[PDB]
């Protein structure tokens, strides 16, 4: 829990003395609509009070809640207050200019051209920038050298470190599209990786993957899935990859929650065999909060919970996919914490899984993954990465982890 703080100010002749960014339709951080303090005006009320800081998140001012408001709504609320201003703020636990992007591109070029390659500098920069900032770096690099940064780094780097850095240079949709393409390489597929991506990505993420996949490979993702999978496993993967799950409605449909729970029990544990199309329809079409409540209501009817019912009712790839999907519905950060543990726990390392999760979740929910990991396994994700990887490859992964717990 981030620290929530109360700050009271007197509105001065020149206002409150700070600047805000963020808001619905004006995100200061990708995927985050919150209002953020971005400047403290010297001599103003905020500065003389001393508590408010850059990076603080505004939760409310007087009678106005500032969560999920547009930028203009926040401005109007903050400019039309009483003289007595009571701010509710949340403390954290970037001001990235073109100068920063150009300097990064220039320093990366120097690191590439250095004899023996200065991998340390390359890692220090790229693993400590957001995906959008890396995109800015890649465009600045191309403008300066007339060469693609990814191609230059492919030649300068090797091993698992090259895999990390080149994956970070792709947009989220490009990275997932190329990982899905790689998973379907050859007869059939790496079902584990296909399952991991298709079961964990949201509607919005899948919609962008579907578009970028077609642009990169000149074929639909759905057609490639169909060509390399079969049976009920194919049906489940195809249904999920469409990214047409019901969106989180504000109204909870309790009658449907009960009927879905009965239908899941009637389709499996209650009867000989399993009505797999019924399971597919319910678990791919209902919203995630709805299904969380369905899986709890299911326990009212069934002698086993949903995960145990899946193990007893189906087998093979279909069982694996359903088990991964239900974990993603119930607790996705815990799901990735478990896959990370499994990638490192035994002899060697499943670097393909370790790299993909660290690259793809570093900007999504890495803090929640780290929290679930430490709570379950007693040691930090940082520690397990330290014990299973070495050198600059380790340093890159540790930066994507973001810290020790």
């Amino acid at each position: 829990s981030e620290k929530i703080m109360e700050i009271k100010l007197i509105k001065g002749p020149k206002g409150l003395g700070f600047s805000i960014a963020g808001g619905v339709g004006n995100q200061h951080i990708p995927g985050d609509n919150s209002i953020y303090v971005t400047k403290i005006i010297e001599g103003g009320a905020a500065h003389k009070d001393g508590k408010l800081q850059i990076g603080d998140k505004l939760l409310a001012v007087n009678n106005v809640c500032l969560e999920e408001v547009t930028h203009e709504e926040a401005v109007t609320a903050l400019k039309n207050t009483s003289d007595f201003v009571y701010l509710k703020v949340a403390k954290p636990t970037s001001a990235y200019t073109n100068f920063d992007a150009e300097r990064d591109a220039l320093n990366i070029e120097t690191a590439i051209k250095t004899k023996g390659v200065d991998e340390v500098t390359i890692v220090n920069i790229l693993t400590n920038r957001s995906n959008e900032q890396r995109q800015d770096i890649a465009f600045a690099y191309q403008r300066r050298t007339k060469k693609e940064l990814a191609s230059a780094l492919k030649s300068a780097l090797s091993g698992h470190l090259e895999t990390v850095i080149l994956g970070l240079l792709k947009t989220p949709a490009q990275y997932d599209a190329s990982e899905l393409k790689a998973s379907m390489k050859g007869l059939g597929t790496d079902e584990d990786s296909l399952i991991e991506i298709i079961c964990s990505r949201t509607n919005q993420e899948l919609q962008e993957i579907n578009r970028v996949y077609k642009e990169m490979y000149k074929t639909d993702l759905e057609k490639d899935i169909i060509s390399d999978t079969s049976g009920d496993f194919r049906k489940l993967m195809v249904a999920l990859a469409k990214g047409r799950r019901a969106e989180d409605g504000s109204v909870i449909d309790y009658e449907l929650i009960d009927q879905d729970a009965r239908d899941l029990y009637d389709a499996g544990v209650k009867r000989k065999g399993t009505d797999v199309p019924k399971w597919i329809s319910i678990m791919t079409e209902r919203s995630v909060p709805h299904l969380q409540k369905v899986f709890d209501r299911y326990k009212s009817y069934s002698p086993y919970d949903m995960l145990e019912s899946i193990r007893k009712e189906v087998k093979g790839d279909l069982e694996n996919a359903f088990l991964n999907l239900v974990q993603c519905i119930q607790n996705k950060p815990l799901y990735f914490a478990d896959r990370l543990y499994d990638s490192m726990k035994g002899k060697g390392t499943r670097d393909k899984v370790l790299i993909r999760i660290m690259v793809s979740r570093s900007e999504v929910d890495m803090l929640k993954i780290r929290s679930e990991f430490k709570r379950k396994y007693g040691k930090s994700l940082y520690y397990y990465i330290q014990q299973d990887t070495k050198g600059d490859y380790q340093k890159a992964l540790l930066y994507l982890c973001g810290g020790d717990d």
Partner: peptide
Amino acid sequence: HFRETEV
């Protein structure tokens, strides 16, 4: 372009 506003 993103908006930043002084208050």
